[PDB]
Amino acid sequence: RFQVLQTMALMVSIMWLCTQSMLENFSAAVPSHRCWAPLLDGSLSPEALLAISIPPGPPHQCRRFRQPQWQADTEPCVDGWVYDRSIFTSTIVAKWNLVCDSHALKPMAQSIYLAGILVGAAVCGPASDRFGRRLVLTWSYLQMAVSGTAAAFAPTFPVYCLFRFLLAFAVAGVMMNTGTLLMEWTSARARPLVMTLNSLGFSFGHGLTAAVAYGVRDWTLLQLAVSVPFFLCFLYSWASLGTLLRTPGLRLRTCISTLCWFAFGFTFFGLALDLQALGSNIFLLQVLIGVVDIPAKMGALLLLSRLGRRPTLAASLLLAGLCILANTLVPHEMGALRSALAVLGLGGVGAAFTCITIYSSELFPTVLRMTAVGLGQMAARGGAILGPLVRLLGVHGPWLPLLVYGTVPVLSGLAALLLPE
């Protein structure tokens, strides 16, 4: 009774935590924009007017003819940008003009968020040890709620990034304490099931985010809505690494497990946080991510049970990488196929997360098990921090970030073939 109720509450918390993580692709979606031109803001056709007021692009994002030319002089967006509000009424990109010259700020915002996750885990470890895990979890709920509300009403971009950093600082503690509490009260034999249940809670959070963002098209309102439930969550909440590396034989397993954690984190947080490239419809992609993760993670658990631990992880990582590579390979015209491939890739990445979480426990003796799992978690968080950054390589071509996202998991899975069991 108590175990199931606690599991349900923590599943709800994880759903909302996934919402916090994945909100960025909605609250930071880049709308179609253009320099604010006077002649565009003898009237003629809007298409013709825009043709004589904005140079053509591969509709140029950030240029405008100095004087309306009827038919070099192109100049930057001196007066600002005009954002298309057909989908989103407001966004951080539209609010702070994170386009073109300052385009790197959005992926940099996502990197700051993930660095906040890393720092929050690092601090909450010793804090959760020093103070009760339940107390730290309650304080993390409170911090998540307040940081989300503040970042919703952030006046300037540095303030928004700072409060996203503190929000991540809090979510790291939330995740740490939720996982620890689930582990403590669950029988050692039932650990794979509990891990799968938590991952399924995250999958449900994907669709929850999709629905909330669909309803609330204002980034301020979206952030505030996703942050409010943590107020209620707070209300009703009431063997060192040196030795691990020293051992000679362990080095192979340690390196490969850490590489797998890093590959999962990098690929997921570099792809999951930018679904605009993956598919045309962000809401549909967000929904399908969870809709496929559910069966994907269930099948991952089934294969893990019957097909084995190592081959299941290898298959999941290879599937993710190959699907991402195909997505960047198949023609951009075939949008449906690319969206399906991206959904399959994210499902495989989630399955790989389940597999590695349930596998790294077995790979190492009980004395070093906690240290190995912690090292894997830290590597995953570092890869997450590096995830959004590689999207900056898209300036040369949008295919390069996806090529990196695909070749990382493929190589990690191939390396996963050397694991013992």
Ligand SMILES: CC(C)(Sc1ccncc1-c1ccc(C#N)c2ccccc12)C(=O)O
């Ligand atoms: C930081 C991560 C990647 S975890 C994490 C931290 C913060 N935000 C989300 C996740 C996360 C990402 C994908 C998941 C999936 N699928 C997932 C499932 C359950 C719990 C968290 C996640 C790690 O620990 O290395």
